[PDB]
Design a protein around this ligand. Structure first.
Ligand SMILES: Nc1nc2c(ncn2[C@@H]2O[C@H](COP(=O)(O)OP(=O)(O)OP(=O)(O)O)[C@@H](O)[C@H]2O)c(=O)[nH]1
Lengths: 80, 232, 488, 94, 82, 72, 49, 82, 69, 75
């Protein structure tokens, strides 16, 4: 995996981002919009739960992720 | 060198501005772009020849369209031109001559009051103009009319105490002016191409000139309409 | 080719947003406002419409150089040869515009720039019948004359939401050259008049009912809009509402950081004057008189506005217009005013009842629509139809009833004999019929095949059951407010 | 902003925020119970409104308990930042 | 103002899905939204965390409980972004 | 008239018993002072683990967010 | 009034200003209001008679 | 009075971190937000008896951050004063 | 400041989902900005009523469902 | 219409049989009568009683309970 040594989150917007969630799932997709409260809008969001064995996988598309239920953000891949 | 403080130096030149590289295009002398106050000066100076009629309504049943209509029906508006005719039920028993149906109407609503119209244009129709002009030595005042019955921050454009600048009294006037002075930039035209005289006879004849002068006016309008009418 | 003109082409001027999105939005009601802008002769309503359209679209062909500059008004919604040459809006040449509100939301509006001249009020009546909100528009100068009052009465009697536009401020600032307090007073007088006429709801800049426009210079604002733009930096998030409420309605800032309701010792003017009107005055006064560099600096500082280097070399009117555009970013505040005003959709019932009859079992899924008026919008015969329930698809058969046969039909009910196809559908957009297959509920579209099925102002329907048909009702003939008594 | 910080330090000295402020002034080791069960013996360096507190001389005490094998575990850290919400009860050891 | 909350309120009317902290998904027409995501729906299927579906006419939700909201592919187009 | 905050101001310099939510325990010590946040401080606070004094903690400072109820 | 305009114009203007200020921002008597209105109407011509 | 001042003043330091669940995080302090959001480049994670999961870049939510183990060469009193 | 528009649901029975899978039936009496539901108490989840008039806290609300249309 | 502030002002003056449920808590309830009210939802309760849930009358007195962890009230 490769990414630029970025200063802040908004500078790397529209990047394929692995986004953890407090309930155990991880949402992977290119981020369109962020917030002061860390609400995120993934362009091609993909629902990936970790069941109690192997990864659960599901496609969502354009979705809002609420900020409170986020654990953290990670860059998965580049734009385009 | 006080009222006419800017133009005075150059108003009488062969080419008004040979250099003045900011104010004109250059020495080719193709385009120009004056600042405000000099434009104001020009306007003031032009008081004798300037169009001097802001109320666009004024040319009512006196536009080129109106003239054309008059032509097309032989319903000459008496202040204006009268042409060679364009061409070579309804009984007294029937109709009721309550309104004596005038020629002025026959061009106003040409398709309605004038039956059997041919080659007839449609004129304008308009809103009432209340451009109140100021006389002198003041600004922003109701004069000609009556009045109605009844966390540490300042508002916008703070530290701009004077509402009106010394030029805005004149700028407003300029803004209301017609096409010559209206604007603060233009392309040149040939002295030839400027019509200092058209604006007098296109607008209405002032007051009680001798018949001959009235005739002259009419003649001029007849020419003008013809020129307008056969686009070359 | 033809003289009495529209677009008649594949390449309709491209929009900033995309029309696919607009049509998608138009799938659901509660997101299609039918505005039907109204007012006296030369209110500026058509000019307002033009402003909106221009704001919406990228580059129009008809938007020539001069109109762009702002010498001539781009009267985009007087498509008829006559309506140009005559200088009057004469028929309904509305537009479908995906309009952004001040708060972030995207609603497709069906505007209808109706005529103002009082002989044409017939045409206007249709707009009232059509539209669920009405942007009444008023000239400041003439104020509310009788015509405006009449219009208001009609709207209230026709059960339609109202959201006023006090238009042509440029006149009172430049033509009349009123002092700012005087201007404020005038405004108060006007709004007072409005309130007097409208016995029910009380209109004001607060609550975002009134809209302060100048379509020649090309700017509208609600106070909410303006405040949002230029009094969000200064004052905090929560106290903004209070500020908004204060601005208008005789409260004086008092040189101090929390105003008094009564008189103040130091300054003279109200908050509305000090915090809006005075700024406008400053703009106008400076956008003519002020040495351009200084003006540029001020714009940079206070408004956060960058003048184009071309705009520096504009003529003083068009320059001013450009500046105004830069200041009041869009016709967004106006849209906010509309949406906020027409947040009641319980009025829909009242409207429908008023038009046809008080009834129910209408949302069974039977498509039915008020055929408003036959128009000649692309030259050809079109029928402007407002759909209420269901959705109409292209190449569908439909029952149609001329509202001559409406009362009679009603009487007879307490055998769908007339019928016709729908050859094509499209959307009015000032100068083009933009073709669309869908024609969803709660909106206005143009259809080919209806026209010849009726004379004026029909209803349509397409029941899937005789029982359903029994449950139906039919619109009354549109009582065109003016009676025609000029016999030729 | 300055008047709020003045009443902050004023309200600390008089209110119960004075205790661990005085513990920082005396600079003693203090035990702190935690949300995920960690008795933190440490020297308090920093102190704010929210009870976020940088800790010198850190010594966390807990029990990683799984497999019927009580393994009371503990570690030393040089310096550590504490978040407020984790704290349950701070106490100054005599 | 929150540009994701901007999107939510712009998404009103479409068939949107919604899972909470509880893990119980929903799906139907949205009706209302605010700064705090005080969501309302119509025609909403209400699948419990086990998978037990219960169709119902309407629902109102509090924003604190919301986890994520499935928006359609239309809001990808326009007009909130640019 | 007997509100919480004035009774709490009367409860200053008096014995109090603190109960909490998760991984929690009753207490018993003389309240020292309070604020608008309801951050507590006790002297001679005894750690009553479900009403059983596990240890005399003494001079302590309890956080506001984990407070459930406070009694005599 | 016309005479006032003629020579002592500043005061006349001032008088107008005060009058208007009174006119609209006041709990003013109705007959008085009508008189004022009449005054302004005549002002529009500035005493023809 | 704000430790946010100090945490803002902590820049380009390689630090360990704990979370609400208790996950370790070894990475350079790229920046810290006024609400504790630890922007970190060149990061390495290890869960709470579990094996390594190293990564390129992680900005973690402020509230999820439990306890940041600071580096060795660190004068606390130098940054605390203005 | 944004008032949750419960005037559509005012004076109607509502199935309030609250913390720990608990349900509350009851006709609505009023509310506030925090969503604290003032409601006439009804049977709590076979089924049994506690109280006559109740006020539920907003933080404890999971959801509130339209029982009445 | 009755906001929670006004309904609790009825509970304040009345002091009628209140039953309280608790936040993040199913195992225990309370039974008393409302005596206080804060600007927050903090309320002091006299004659309060700890009442474990019907899956007895256990001892409890007068309590200032931190009101941010409330669920039910009903006087
Ligand atoms: N001074 C000034 N004039 C304006 C303004 N807006 C419009 N006008 C003028 O008045 C006319 C009113 O606008 P239009 O759109 O042309 O008229 P309209 O609204 O179509 O009137 P109807 O045909 O009755 O609908 C324009 O033709 C302009 O010349 C303004 O803001 N200031």
């Amino acid at each position: 995996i490769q990414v630029a040594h970025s200063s802040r989150l908004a500078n790397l917007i529209d990047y394929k981002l692995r986004v953890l969630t407090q309930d155990g799932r991880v949402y992977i997709g290119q981020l369109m919009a962020f917030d002061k409260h860390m609400n995120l809008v993934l362009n091609e969001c993909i629902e990936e739960r970790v069941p109690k064995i192997k990864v659960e996988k599901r496609v969502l598309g354009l979705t809002i992720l609420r900020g409170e239920q986020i654990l953290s953000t990670v860059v998965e891949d580049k734009p385009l | 060198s006080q009222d006419d403080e800017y133009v005075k130096d150059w108003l009488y030149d062969s080419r008004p501005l040979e250099e003045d590289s900011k104010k004109v295009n250059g020495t080719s002398y193709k385009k120009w772009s004056f600042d405000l106050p000099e434009m104001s000066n020009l306007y003031r100076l032009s008081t004798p020849l300037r169009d001097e009629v802001t109320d666009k309504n004024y040319y009512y049943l006196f536009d080129k369209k109106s003239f054309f209509n008059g032509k097309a029906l032989n319903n000459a508006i008496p202040g204006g031109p009268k042409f060679e005719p364009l061409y070579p039920f309804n009984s007294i028993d029937r109709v009721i001559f309550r309104v004596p149906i005038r020629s002025e109407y026959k061009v106003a609503f040409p398709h309605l009051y004038n039956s059997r119209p041919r080659s007839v244009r449609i004129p304008w129709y308009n809103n009432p103009v209340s451009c109140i002009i100021q006389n002198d030595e003041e600004y922003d005042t109701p004069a000609l009319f009556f009045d109605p019955s009844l966390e540490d921050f300042a508002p916008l454009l703070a530290e701009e105490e004077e509402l009106i600048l010394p030029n805005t009294k004149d700028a407003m006037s300029l803004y209301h002016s017609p096409f010559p002075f209206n604007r603060t930039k233009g392309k040149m035209v040939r002295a030839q191409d400027v019509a200092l005289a058209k604006k007098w006879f296109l607008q209405h004849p002032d007051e009680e000139y001798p018949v001959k002068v009235k005739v002259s006016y009419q003649k001029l309008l007849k020419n003008y309409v013809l020129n307008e009418l056969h686009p070359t | 080719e033809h003289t009495i003109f529209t677009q008649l082409k594949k390449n309709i001027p491209k929009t900033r947003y995309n029309r696919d999105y607009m049509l998608s939005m138009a799938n659901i009601p509660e997101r299609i406002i039918n505005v039907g802008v109204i007012g006296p002769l030369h209110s500026g309503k058509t000019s307002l419409m033009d402003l909106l359209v221009i704001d919406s679209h990228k580059r129009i062909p008809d938007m020539s150089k001069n109109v762009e500059l702002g010498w001539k008004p781009l009267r985009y919604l007087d498509n008829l040869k006559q309506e140009i040459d005559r200088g009057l809006s004469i028929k309904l040449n509305g537009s479908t515009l995906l309009c952004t509100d001040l708060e972030s939301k995207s609603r497709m509006i069906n505007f209808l720039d109706a005529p103002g001249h009082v002989n044409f009020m017939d045409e206007t009546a249709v707009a009232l019948a059509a539209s669920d909100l009405v942007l009444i528009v008023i000239d400041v100068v003439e104020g509310v004359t009788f015509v405006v009052e009449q219009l208001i009465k009609q709207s209230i009697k026709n059960n339609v939401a109202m959201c006023f536009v006090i238009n042509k401020l440029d006149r009172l600032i430049l033509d009349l050259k009123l002092p700012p307090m005087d201007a404020y007073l005038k405004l108060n007088h006007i709004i007072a008049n409005i309130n007097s006429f409208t016995k029910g709801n009380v209109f004001s800049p607060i609550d975002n009912n009134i809209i302060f426009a100048s379509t020649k210079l090309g700017f509208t604002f609600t106070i909410k809009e303006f405040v949002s733009y230029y009094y969000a930096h200064s004052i905090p998030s929560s106290k903004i509402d209070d500020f908004t409420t204060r601005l208008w309605g005789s409260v004086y800032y008092h040189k101090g950081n929390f105003r008094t309701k009564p008189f103040e010792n130091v300054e003279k003017y109200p908050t509305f004057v000090e915090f809006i009107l005075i700024p406008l005055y400053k703009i106008f006064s400076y956008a003519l008189s002020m040495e351009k560099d200084k003006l540029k600096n001020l714009l940079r500082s206070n408004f956060r506005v960058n003048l184009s280097q071309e705009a520096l070399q504009y003529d003083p009117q068009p320059f001013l217009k450009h500046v105004l555009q830069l200041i009041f970013r869009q016709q967004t505040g106006l849209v906010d005013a509309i949406t906020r005003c027409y947040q009641p959709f319980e009025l829909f019932d009242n409207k429908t009842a008023h038009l046809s009859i008080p009834g129910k079992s209408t949302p069974e899924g039977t498509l039915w629509a008020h055929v408003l008026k036959t128009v000649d919008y692309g030259g050809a015969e079109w029928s402007l139809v407002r759909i209420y329930s269901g959705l109409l698809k292209r190449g569908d058969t439909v029952r149609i009833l001329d509202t001559s046969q409406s009362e009679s039909r009603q009487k007879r009910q307490l055998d769908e004999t007339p019928s016709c196809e729908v050859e094509e559908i499209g959307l009015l957009g000032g100068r083009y019929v933009y073709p669309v297959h869908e024609a969803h509920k709660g909106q206005i579209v143009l259809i080919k095949g209806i026209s010849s099925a009726y004379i004026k102002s029909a209803t349509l329907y397409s029941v899937k059951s005789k029982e359903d048909m029994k449950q139906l009702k039919f619109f009354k003939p549109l009582d065109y407010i003016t009676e025609a008594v000029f016999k030729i | 902003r300055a008047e709020l910080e003045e009443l902050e330090e004023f309200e600390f000295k008089h209110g119960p925020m004075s205790l661990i402020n005085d513990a920082m002034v005396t600079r003693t080791p203090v035990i702190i119970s935690l949300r995920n069960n960690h008795k933190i013996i440490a020297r308090v360096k920093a102190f704010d409104r929210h009870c976020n507190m940088v800790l010198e001389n850190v010594k966390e005490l807990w029990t990683e308990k799984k497999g019927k094998n009580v393994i009371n575990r503990e570690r030393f850290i040089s310096k550590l930042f504490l978040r407020g919400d984790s704290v349950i009860v701070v106490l100054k050891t005599p | 103002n929150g540009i994701p909350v901007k999107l939510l309120n712009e998404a009103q009317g479409h068939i949107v899905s919604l899972e909470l902290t509880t893990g119980a998904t929903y799906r139907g027409k949205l009706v209302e939204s605010e700064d705090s995501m005080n969501v309302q729906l119509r025609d909403v299927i209400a699948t419990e965390p086990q998978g037990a579906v219960t169709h119902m006419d309407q629902i109102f939700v509090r924003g604190s409980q919301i986890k994520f909201i499935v928006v359609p592919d239309l809001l990808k187009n326009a007009p909130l972004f640019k | 008239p007997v509100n919480p905050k004035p009774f709490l101001k009367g409860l200053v310099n008096h014995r109090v018993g603190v109960k909490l939510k998760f991984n929690s325990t009753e207490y018993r010590g003389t309240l020292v002072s309070t604020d608008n946040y309801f951050n507590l401080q006790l002297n001679e606070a005894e750690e009553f683990v479900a009403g059983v004094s596990h240890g005399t903690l003494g001079e302590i400072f309890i956080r506001c967010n984990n407070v459930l109820y406070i009694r005599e | 009034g016309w005479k006032l305009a003629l020579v002592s114009k500043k005061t006349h203007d001032m008088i107008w200003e005060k009058l208007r200020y009174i006119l609209q921002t006041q709990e003013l008597s109705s007959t008085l209001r009508e008189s004022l209105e009449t005054l302004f109407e005549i002002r529009q011509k500035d005493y023809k008679s | 009075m704000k430790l946010v001042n100090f945490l803002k003043k902590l820049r380009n330091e390689q630090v360990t971190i704990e979370l609400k669940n208790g996950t370790t995080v070894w990475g350079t302090l790229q920046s810290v937000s006024p609400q504790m959001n630890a922007i970190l480049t060149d990061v390495k994670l290890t869960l709470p008896s579990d094996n390594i999961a190293s990564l390129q870049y992680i900005n973690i939510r402020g509230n999820t951050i439990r306890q940041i183990i600071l580096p060795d060469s660190l004068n606390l009193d130098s940054l605390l004063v203005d | 400041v944004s008032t949750p528009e419960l005037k559509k649901y005012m004076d109607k029975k509502i199935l309030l989902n609250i913390n720990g899978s608990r349900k509350v039936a009851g006709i609505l009496r009023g509310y506030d900005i925090f969503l604290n539901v003032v409601l006439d108490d009804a049977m709590e989840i076979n089924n049994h009523q506690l109280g006559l008039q109740t006020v539920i806290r907003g933080n404890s609300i999971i959801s509130l469902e339209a029982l009445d249309a | 219409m009755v906001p929670p502030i006004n309904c609790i002002f009825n509970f304040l003056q009345q002091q009628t049989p209140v039953t309280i449920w608790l936040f993040e808590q199913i195992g225990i309830r309370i039974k008393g009568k409302i005596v206080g009210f804060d600007e927050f939802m903090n309320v002091v309760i006299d004659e309060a009683v700890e009442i474990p849930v019907n899956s007895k009358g256990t001892p409890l007195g007068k309590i200032l309970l931190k009101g941010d962890n409330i669920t039910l009230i009903t006087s």
